[PDB]
């Protein structure tokens, strides 16, 4: 699809069997969700935003479905204001910016 | 252009008569730059992201050029870690996400 930017570009994601929604975010290296049902091990990591740096949980090799495209990648769980899909996953669904 | 997301989507901009670079940020409602020479009045504003809030100066109807495309819109200036182009300007140049 071709998605304009008059509103937040939010799409449906599926993760650990749950429907969530997340913002396609070209300004994020990484994918960050507030809360997942992934039951296993994670590694403590830190990310930075405009305001400073925060602790996240890093989950590796996560099956995740974006907008009906099935991918595998790294999902971070952290204190983000809204779920964001980063470039790490957007590259895998062949997402580009165009003008 | 068509911009893939394997690296950060950084483009050239021109504002207050200076060439800068800035990140195409579909996860930013607003456009924020670390420094600029602009004329006329600003009003104070707070913006939120990962890791807290930033205090900025808001300038309205500012002429900007993004990859050569001339656009007019609101620019925020403050101590961001990186120059960011938000949706408020990306819509002006017809930027879309495509997959």
């Amino acid at each position: 699809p071709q998605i304009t930017l008059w509103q937040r570009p939010i799409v449906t994601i599926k993760i650990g069997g749950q429907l969530k929604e997340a913002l396609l975010n070209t300004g994020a290296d990484d994918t960050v969700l507030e809360e997942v049902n992934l039951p296993g091990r994670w590694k403590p990591k830190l990310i930075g935003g405009i305001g400073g740096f925060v602790k996240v949980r890093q989950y590796d090799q996560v099956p995740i479905e974006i907008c009906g495209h099935k991918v595998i990648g790294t999902v971070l769980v952290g204190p983000t204001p809204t779920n964001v899909i980063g470039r790490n996953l957007m590259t895998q669904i062949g997402c580009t910016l165009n003008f | 252009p068509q911009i893939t997301l394997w690296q950060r989507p950084i483009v050239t901009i021109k504002i207050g008569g200076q060439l800068k670079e800035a990140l195409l940020n579909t996860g930013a409602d607003d456009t924020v730059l670390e420094e600029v020479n602009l004329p006329g009045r600003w009003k104070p504003k707070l913006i939120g992201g990962i890791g807290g809030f930033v205090k900025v100066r808001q300038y309205d109807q500012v002429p900007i050029e993004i990859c050569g495309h001339k656009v007019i819109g609101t620019v925020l200036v403050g101590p961001t870690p990186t120059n960011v182009i938000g949706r408020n300007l990306m819509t002006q140049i017809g930027c879309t996400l495509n997959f």
Binding site: T80 | N25, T82
Partner: peptide, 7 residues
Amino acid sequence: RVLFEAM
């Protein structure tokens, strides 16, 4: 909001 994020 400005959701720049970098790790």
